[PDB]
Design a protein around this nucleic acid. Structure first.
Lengths: 102, 90, 92, 19, 105, 205, 20, 90, 101, 103, 92, 205
DNA sequence: ATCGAGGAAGTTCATATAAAAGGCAAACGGAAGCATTCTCAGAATATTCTTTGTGATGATGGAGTTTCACTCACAGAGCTGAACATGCCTTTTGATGGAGCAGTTTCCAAATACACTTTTGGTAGAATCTGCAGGTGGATATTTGAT
DNA sequence: ATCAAATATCCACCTGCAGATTCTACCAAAAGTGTATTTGGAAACTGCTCCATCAAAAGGCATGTTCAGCTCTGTGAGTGAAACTCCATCATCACAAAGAATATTCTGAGAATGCTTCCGTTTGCCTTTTATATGAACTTCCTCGAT
């Protein structure tokens, strides 16, 4: 029947997500990740996190990864490609260097 | 990441809650047109090493002024000293 | 019982846009902004008091603590407008 | 005068989990 | 009868408050009397610089309450307020509308 | 040897008050008292508590013996937690009961939580620090049960870890010589205040 | 009143050409 | 760019003294196997804007402590303030 | 003949990484810095301490080396071997303004 | 009667740190346990890169440390590269690093 | 009458390499090194003495300025061989 | 109008001591003393020189009149500079000499840093500051030549720009009414000390 | 052009969260007045150090031409990311919930500024005395290539 | 099938620039000795705010399968940098008397600290009170595709 192109296309989803400002990772799986790395750096004493602190990471851990995917995608438009490989996220962390992720 | 369970089978693990379509919706905000199928292992490798250079500074600021409650005023300081000032809460 | 600058920002808003409000989470930025231009400026006007080994942060040592920090043509107006509000601090 | 383990610049930026 | 400092200077930011904060900070051991009337005059200018630009992001989006996103469209769309806030992220920030020409058509 | 069990003992000795510090350690029965001659009992705490762990990190380091130190502290500060009383039905140094401590969660770990207290009047202080089949146990939210071999009443501590409250009423009941447990509204603060509502209503029936 | 500084846009910093 | 020169012909410029075979020998140290020919008009522009962020900061320190001589400790300070801590002279 | 030209770059890259000079001559470069200082509050030709111009050329050339060492990784990325101005400019775009303007 | 440095088993000056830690205005009051502990750390770092420059000087067959032997003694070590991240060394040179894609 | 650390560097070097010298420009570095680790440490233990709103830089606040600044394995030894020099200074 | 002469006039006025600051300004004859009454000449210097130029840049911004101040500063600091004596040979307001200030060096400057002063004992006051074909004249190393219309001797400042030392003598010889110019070893510190070696040896021959 | 048939923007809304408005009161803090302590601006001066020039002298940059190594546009074969469509598992809301943990509170005490006076060590600075490293060759010894 | 021959490492004396050891003395600094200040440890006590269950309720992720947009390699067409040698012109070294400008030491008058008594601006707490931004629905209309 009336088959369009690729939900034609991606381009609705980009201009819908750059429009808004909400959070993108689900709060409870991220709250289980932050409470597991926090149990390693403490020698076992499991810390209570405030409810305002687990917003205070996720507003950075998005706004660092979102910036990394912009700043890597200037390399896959550099390599003649369009598709983003891991060879480029591995390189965007090597050109700022020691200040984009140790 | 030390764990002492011996059963040779586990959960997703624990990081596999940052799903496939969540890492997409991060990158789609960035202007990525089209992802490989290998970023979904890479980005969880980055997000594991982003928190370890924030939580290691948050959990010392907490442990100094002797507490058990990692507030939002530590995680603002753990990003301010780090190089990323965050203007939401501090 | 902590204090902040959420009153003083608001009067500046009513002076340049006489109708617009400002939501309560977007005052928490304009507080933590002005706690950060402050602690950069007078965190560094401390240091020209130390490199010349003086002891008084005069009004003159905020002037070069501005000219280092605010870049571009932003600082040429800020240093123009600090000294405007110093001439009419004395001549009052 | 003891030591830590001083390795190398000890490649990173291609990093994976220990699997 | 020739009252408080902030009105005496024609400012809006508290000149009394900053002279306390320069003393509690241990920035130097003595703080001059012309100093916070210059420092609070600067901060009032910068706050009257964002909100003049962050008024428009409420105006061109046809709204009357400045949300955080109406600051993000005023910090990143100015040449000098970019380079001053080089490190600074903003919670509830969003990003700019970046349109790559090679992804488009 | 070990390093991460020191964080448990340092955190517990800091909770121990100044005024009863050697009152504990004689019962704790681990440190050499000839070095307690060198152990300062006078100066500031954060220097003093480093000096005791320095003597624990020479002889032996077992977390299984470290849980007994948190027991003796809880024995003497019984106004801290809110206290709870159960009773079991349908059914001494407890050496037959150490082999029958808990017949559950062997595939989680072999021996997870176990700590005893050897006292007259059947005053055992069984410590349970819960945990699933993947997690190293929660060593900072324990569960204390003071159950007697003759009288079927127990003095159970409050633990905010739920999902184990009937799991303890099943595993520890088969562990002793009983089959059924009930849950009462005897949620009290003191142990001797619970004596006037349990031991008065059981030894004088 | 409340005057202005020439606020343009991003300006694409990062390319160098002799001013002409 | 402060200049009021007007003759429509001159010397090189003043920047046209950073030679071609120097900007080769910078890049050959960098590992560059083979340079383009347009890098020579490039690196004269990247070097010019590097100095307008060290000399503009080191001439503020010297105009403050009322001098005319831009000493060695000023350019160390205008680089420590900039973020590039130098260890030769401090 | 015109087939035996000594392989004269890989001796060079092996030469310069072994040594530690200053690669730009002084009086070319020292007339560059003294021009830029005139553009800020004109007229006053500030005297320069002679150890300062060694302190601003150990910090220019140790930045331009680490721009060419770092922009070249994009030329190896795109399949090339040669540099280009489309390669140095993408080093400065990623470094994310405080390093280059 | 006794230097404080001998009482600590150190070599960096205890009091010179302490006089700097007071006259620097870092706080109004300064502990007496502090500049022992700060002059004990500062020993360990300058005994750390000079051990690494010590090996790097014998490997270049010299017996006197020039500044190039520090640039190699930091950059060929992981944890000191991160500490001296944004720091250039005058008369430093670079590492010997070729792209490994040349021939 | 300017002072420096240069006697103290050159006493440590005789303790780990008994036969090696150090040139007078490399000593010019090891000054501007240890005039900088000292400023990052005690310029940030000054900040924990303001967040907790104390007033005395104790020895405890140099500890959690080292555990923030020095990364990797270089922290767990600086805090190791640091406190070994304090349990000697007290017990004396 | 003009902006970049501010650091010429702000830097110059600061070198005047507080003993004779207002003596220069009344001798400069550029400002009306109706305005001079406004300025408080009692407080700190660095705030005073802002209010002066805030008058001076709003009355007239004038480089051709900015140099005339710096003549007058060297008029009352004659003792500091080393004064050299020349002499021309083989050859009233000198109004042709004002129009023929510069019969030299046409591709760079029409007038170099043109300066005059009507002072008795035949005194012209010339301030020259050199500048080449693309280099604007350096406003911080002047040249003070004080030639008298009757006596052939000129009182010339020791000027630390070299490569201009015969360039100025002959171009002053051509534009004035002379053909030969000689140079002497009469290079001293004071002007009146040079009076006893020049005006004694010329007016009493 | 023929055409339905989606999609898209608009005002047709009213609700409930999130705001301006109001007055206190009070704990807080900033302004005024006045008498007292002190930094440092002005000024005159000793002298280290940057400019400006001459002149060799030679080290290297500039200018031109060739020939090969490399950049660029294409084309065609294999693969791989996106859409889609069908179900369930896992996020999220909301409430009660103890309750652990933090904030605030009142003491006294070991640890701290402070000042004076003794000395030591470090210590910084100059002048003198050894010593490593640059250096050129004594080129013999050398391995890649052209006999 | 072996000299040609710069290349690399070696060896060696040798000038010399730059560390190393002396030493004074002395200046400056730190260290012991008392004595009065004061913080912050420590315990106690009330409270906000966190973990932890139950649980509908459904929204959103997952698994599989199909197809076109895509990256990857190879080829030839063709441009553009390394190489070279050839010669001069610009950078380097040294000395240069030279002196602008940095530096170090006096002096006193403004300017800033400290204290008391003072008035008001600024935080909070409801509480009232207004409002703008929100979803859902209305209905017109733009716009896009099968022909």
């Amino acid at each position: 029947h009336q088959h369009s192109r690729r939900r034609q296309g991606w381009l609705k989803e980009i201009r819908k997500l750059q429009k808004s400002t909400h959070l993108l990772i689900r709060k409870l799986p991220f709250s289980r990740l932050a409470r597991e790395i926090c149990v390693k750096f403490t020698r076992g004493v499991d810390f209570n996190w405030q409810a305002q602190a687990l917003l205070a990471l996720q507003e950075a851990a998005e706004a660092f990864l979102v910036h990394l995917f912009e700043d890597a995608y200037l390399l896959t438009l550099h390599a003649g490609r369009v598709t983003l490989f891991p060879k480029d996220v591995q390189l965007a962390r090597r050109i700022r260097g020691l200040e984009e992720g140790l | 990441k030390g764990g002492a369970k011996r059963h040779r089978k586990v959960l997703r693990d624990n990081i596999q809650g940052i799903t496939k379509p969540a890492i997409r919706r991060l990158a789609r905000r960035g202007g990525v047109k089209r992802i490989s199928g290998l970023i979904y292992e890479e980005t969880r490798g980055v997000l594991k090493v982003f928190l370890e250079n924030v939580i290691r500074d948050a959990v010392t600021y907490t442990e100094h002024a002797k507490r058990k409650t990692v507030t939002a005023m530590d995680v603002v300081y753990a990003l301010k000293r780090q190089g990323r000032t965050l203007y939401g809460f501090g | 019982r902590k204090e902040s600058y959420s009153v003083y920002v608001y009067k500046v808003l009513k002076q340049v846009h006489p109708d617009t409000g400002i939501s309560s989470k977007a005052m928490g930025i304009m507080n933590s902004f002005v706690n950060d231009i402050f602690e950069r400026i007078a965190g560094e006007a401390s240091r020209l008091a130390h490199y010349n080994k003086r002891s008084t942060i005069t009004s003159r040592e905020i002037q070069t603590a501005v000219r280092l920090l605010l870049p571009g043509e932003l600082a040429k107006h800020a240093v123009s407008e600090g000294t405007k509000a110093v001439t009419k601090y004395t001549s009052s | 005068k003891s030591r830590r383990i001083s390795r190398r610049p000890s490649d990173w930026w291609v990093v994976k989990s220990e699997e | 009868k020739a009252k408080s400092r902030s009105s005496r200077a024609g400012l809006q930011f508290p000149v009394g408050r900053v002279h306390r904060l320069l003393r509690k900070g241990n920035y130097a051991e003595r703080v001059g009397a012309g100093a916070p009337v210059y420092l609070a005059a600067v901060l009032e200018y910068l706050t009257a610089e964002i909100l003049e630009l962050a008024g428009n992001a409420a105006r061109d989006n046809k709204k009357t309450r400045i949300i955080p996103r109406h600051l993000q469209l005023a910090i990143r769309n100015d040449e000098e307020l970019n380079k001053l806030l080089g490190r600074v992220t903003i919670a509830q920030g969003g990003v700019l509308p970046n349109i790559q020409s090679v992804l488009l058509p | 040897m070990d390093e991460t069990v020191a964080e448990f003992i340092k955190r517990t000795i800091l909770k121990i008050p100044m005024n009863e510090l050697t009152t504990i350690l004689k019962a704790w029965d681990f440190l050499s008292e000839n070095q307690l001659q060198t152990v300062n009992f006078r100066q500031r705490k954060e220097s003093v508590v480093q000096h005791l762990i320095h003597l624990c990190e020479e002889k032996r380091a077992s977390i299984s013996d470290a849980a007994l130190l948190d027991i003796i502290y809880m024995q003497f500060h019984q106004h801290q937690k809110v206290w709870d009383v159960f009773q079991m039905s349908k059914g001494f140094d407890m050496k037959q009961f150490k082999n029958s401590f808990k017949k559950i969660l062997q595939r989680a770990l072999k021996n997870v939580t176990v700590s005893f207290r050897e006292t007259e009047e059947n005053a055992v202080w069984i410590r349970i620090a819960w945990g699933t089949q993947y997690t190293k146990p929660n060593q900072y939210k324990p569960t204390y049960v003071v159950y007697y071999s003759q009288t079927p009443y127990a003095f159970t501590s409050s633990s905010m870890l739920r999902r184990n409250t009937p799991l303890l009423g099943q595993a520890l009941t088969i562990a002793s010589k009983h089959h059924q447990i009930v849950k009462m509204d005897l949620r009290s603060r003191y142990l001797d205040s619970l004596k006037a509502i349990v031991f008065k209503q059981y030894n004088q029936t």
